[PDB]
Write a protein that binds this DNA or RNA. Structure first.
Lengths: 232, 179, 73, 190
RNA sequence: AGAACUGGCGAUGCGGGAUGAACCGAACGUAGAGUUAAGGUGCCGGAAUACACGCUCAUCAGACCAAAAGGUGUUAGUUCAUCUAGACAGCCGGACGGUGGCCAUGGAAGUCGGAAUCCGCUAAGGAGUGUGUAACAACUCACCGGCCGAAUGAACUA
RNA sequence: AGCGAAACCACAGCCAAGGGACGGGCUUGGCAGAAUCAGCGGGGGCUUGUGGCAGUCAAGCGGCGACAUUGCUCAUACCGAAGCAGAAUUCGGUAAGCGUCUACUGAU
């Protein structure tokens, strides 16, 4: 007794368990014999609608269904475990998000697509904002004045506690509208975005950051090359 | 709900008369004790099955008392027109009162009163919830009819809501016979 | 006090400066005070608490059981 | 299971120094010094390499083991206080009656005076503990800042200020006058 | 309660049960010596504040049947789930398309309400568990992923 | 001043509890003045708060079955919650405060 009382809210969904991993484990091995070229992606940050657009942009190319550490075991971390020759060296070169592309498209097609592809994204933590913005020194609005304040809508009172406490800014409620006494500088160029700084920009919807999937290593089922035309 | 409460009280009185007469002629502790539980047993059963009406009464009680103290007898100024076309802010201008100014269609769901004095005589302005039927709108219909007042109709021509006056004029004729 | 004299004060004023902190702290403390209440509250207080507490757990368990059938089906 | 020996580690930054004997703990650093008494907890200290201090309990039960971790937290708080320092910000907001907060030095105690709280004629005096210093925030609307080395003194003083401003049997939703801890940041944050 | 059977008392001292019908041992001439029955060995009270293993903080404990159940009290086990393909927890990210699913209707966009609760890709995502708005919006879990680094979680027995 | 009885008299006649049914003698604790004397007159390991009959279902106990289930039959003060805007108020807890020969005492 005297233990944390576990809490859970009843929902239709349920945990997948290890059986899901087993299907994941075999999926990578099957792809090595089906597709021609193998690529590993390092998209440390993702957006699901953007991922679907990348996934749906083509049919032959397939993003492997699996988990990073499971991918390593599926690919084989040793010469005695590799499903194909020279694959074990390739597996140990990727870490983090489960980025990996299996496709039959030519290498020139792969590099051209990723190099040209680019999309906007929110200022994620650990990054530096490419711009600076100061909140108006009076009543604040939904967009913070980035768009004309006349067109902007006043911030809803319900979000005041988040700004006052979570973001730590000295906000207060005045007749249902949040007000500040000074033009608080949310962030500036060169500063590494803390979670609070990123959240403030995220709350305002300022997608002042670019996003593109970075790929490092390339592999083939017969050439077995470990060339890495890394693009950042 | 009120009828059920009276019925429950009558049954409680029947409970006392029945068991008290039986209890006063008892001859053993268990008989009196067991019969005592029987007497109070029905009271619990009667009240226990009365849970549904009781909940409704409490909700009405916590809301009926909060209703504005509008006086049909004294002089009042009814406000009517297209939903929250400038009318809602008008009440606050006349006297010390607060009404939501955010201009969405039905900015007010219930009545408001604002007291002001003219010629050393008390007056109270009344704001309608809104008229397009809807049960909420039904509150205004009876307020217009059964309140001694000269109602003011609100419309816009150049600045607020840009709505067509044709609809307002046509809607006005619908209420014309009543008020 | 027209009708909405306090619900218009939840907004346009906020409940307090730090209101959720008091409520959040109290909710966590309820788990600890429940144990204290069970051991304390002698007499009729304990009997009522024990009977009421047992019903709450029994009712809670029934809700979980009903959901399982709905979730699976 | 009646752990034979449970150990905890406390990292000591080079900027501070700690002397340990029979359980009166002293911490010295750039911001000052702190003292704590742990004779009632029956823990054993040990200096490893002047950068890590080990606290261990032998044959400690579950009730005793739980107290072992508290020593690390209290010692860690003292280390952080002497290095970083604790700053408890508070804001004395009001609806109608302006809350006036001032400091008086009756008998040299530097008592904190609160006046015109919700129109009350009574003047509320809040004592100031040793080590904690009061500094009114500049250009910040109705903000008061509490700073000090000891967490207990700084935190307790903030609690007393908020507690003594309780509204006497009134609708909490309708009445907002009071003092609340807006933030619990450090003095030299980085 | 009542029919009957067998034992203790009924005529009975002794030690213990702090006193006590019917409880435990023991069936008596007056004496000296030694061992015991039940009871006890901190004092009253004659005898070890003996040893060994565990167990409990009780705000009249413990030594004196209304108790089925309650308790984030404590201690040892029983049956299952996960686990170096990274068990628990703590932070961060994703948390999607049909779709503002169909109907009441100023409005229910997942979250005032009534029947389904379908579908594609996914790394996993409920016509959505709550917070939240006049309705949006925004936060969160359940569901996965990233940093951490081994045992952890669920119900029961005593 | 001088004279001078009667009734009655096993013995004593202090408290809390255990003394099985008799506590006044037994037991656990505390008491008691040697001695004397006047008044007020004083005496002479039960229990509570939630029904009878009939019926479905089941956490479990091993065929029985908890709760849910269907038919009729304080005025005071201090705290916590209440659409408690104010006043007044109910609810819950705490204080149970606050209200509709010998006992005693004078005297040596």
């Amino acid at each position: 007794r005297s233990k944390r009382s576990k809490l859970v809210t009843l929902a239709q969904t349920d945990k997948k368990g290890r059986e899901n991993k087993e299907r994941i484990f075999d999926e990578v091995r099957e792809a090595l014999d089906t597709y021609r070229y193998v690529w590993v992606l390092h998209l440390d940050d993702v957006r699901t609608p953007v991922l679907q657009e990348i996934r749906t942009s083509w049919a032959g190319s397939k993003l492997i269904m699996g988990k990073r550490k499971v991918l390593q075991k599926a690919l084989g971390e040793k010469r005695e475990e590799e499903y194909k020759e020279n694959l074990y060296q390739l597996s140990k070169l990727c870490s983090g998000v489960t980025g990996l592309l299996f496709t039959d498209e030519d290498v020139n097609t792969v590099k051209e697509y990723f190099k040209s592809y680019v999309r906007s994204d929110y200022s994620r933590p650990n990054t530096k904002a490419p711009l600076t913005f100061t909140i108006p020194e009076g009543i604040v609005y939904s967009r913070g004045g980035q768009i004309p304040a006349e067109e902007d809508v006043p911030m809803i009172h319900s979000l005041e506690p988040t700004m006052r406490n979570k973001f730590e800014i000295p906000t207060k409620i005045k007749a249902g509208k949040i007000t500040i006494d000074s033009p608080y500088l949310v962030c500036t160029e060169g500063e590494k975005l803390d979670v609070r700084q990123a959240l403030i920009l995220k709350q305002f919807g300022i997608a002042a950051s670019e996003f593109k999937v970075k790929v490092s290593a390339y592999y083939d089922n017969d050439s077995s090359t470990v060339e890495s035309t890394n693009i950042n | 709900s009120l009828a059920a409460i009276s019925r429950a009280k009558s049954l409680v009185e029947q409970v006392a008369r029945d068991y008290v007469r039986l209890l006063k002629f008892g001859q053993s502790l268990f008989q009196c004790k067991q019969l005592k539980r029987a007497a109070l047993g029905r009271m619990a059963t009667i009240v226990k099955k009365l849970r549904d009406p009781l909940a409704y009464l409490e909700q009405v009680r916590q809301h009926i008392g909060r209703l504005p103290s509008i006086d049909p007898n004294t002089r009042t100024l009814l406000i009517c027109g297209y939903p929250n076309v400038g009318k809602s802010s008008f009440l606050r201008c006349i006297t010390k009162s607060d009404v939501d100014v955010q201009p969405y269609a039905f900015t007010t769901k219930s009545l408001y009163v604002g007291h002001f004095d003219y010629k050393y005589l008390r007056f109270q302005a009344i704001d309608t919830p809104g008229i397009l039927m809807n049960n909420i709108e039904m509150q205004s219909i009876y307020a217009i009819a059964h309140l001694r007042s000269c109602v003011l109709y609100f419309m816009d021509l150049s600045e607020q809501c840009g709505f067509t006056i044709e609809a307002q004029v046509k809607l006005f004729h619908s209420i014309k016979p009543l008020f | 006090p027209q009708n909405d004299y306090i619900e218009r004060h939840i907004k346009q004023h906020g409940k307090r400066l730090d209101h959720e902190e008091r409520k959040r702290k109290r909710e966590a403390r309820e788990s600890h005070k429940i144990s204290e209440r069970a051991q304390k509250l002698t007499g009729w207080k304990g009997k009522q608490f024990a009977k009421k507490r047992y019903a709450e757990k029994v009712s809670m368990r029934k809700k979980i059981k009903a959901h399982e059938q709905s979730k699976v089906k | 299971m009646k752990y034979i020996q449970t150990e905890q580690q406390i990292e000591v930054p080079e900027g501070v120094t700690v002397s340990i004997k029979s359980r009166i703990v002293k911490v010295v650093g750039p911001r000052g010094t702190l003292t704590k008494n742990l004779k009632h907890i029956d823990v054993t200290f040990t200096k490893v390499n002047n950068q890590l201090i080990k606290v261990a309990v032998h044959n400690g039960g579950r009730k005793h083991v739980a107290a072992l971790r508290t020593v690390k937290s209290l010692v860690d708080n003292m280390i952080t206080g002497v290095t970083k320092g604790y700053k408890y910000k508070m804001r004395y907001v009001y609806a109608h009656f302006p809350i006036n907060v001032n400091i008086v030095e009756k008998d040299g105690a530097k008592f904190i005076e609160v006046r015109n709280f919700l129109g009350d004629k009574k003047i509320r005096n809040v004592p100031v503990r040793d080590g904690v210093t009061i500094e009114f925030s500049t250009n910040v609307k109705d903000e008061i800042v509490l700073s000090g080395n000891s967490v207990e003194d700084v935190s307790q003083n903030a609690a007393d200020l908020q507690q003594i401003c309780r509204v006497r049997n009134k609708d909490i939703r309708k009445f907002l006058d009071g003092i609340y801890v807006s933030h619990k940041g450090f003095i030299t944050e980085d």
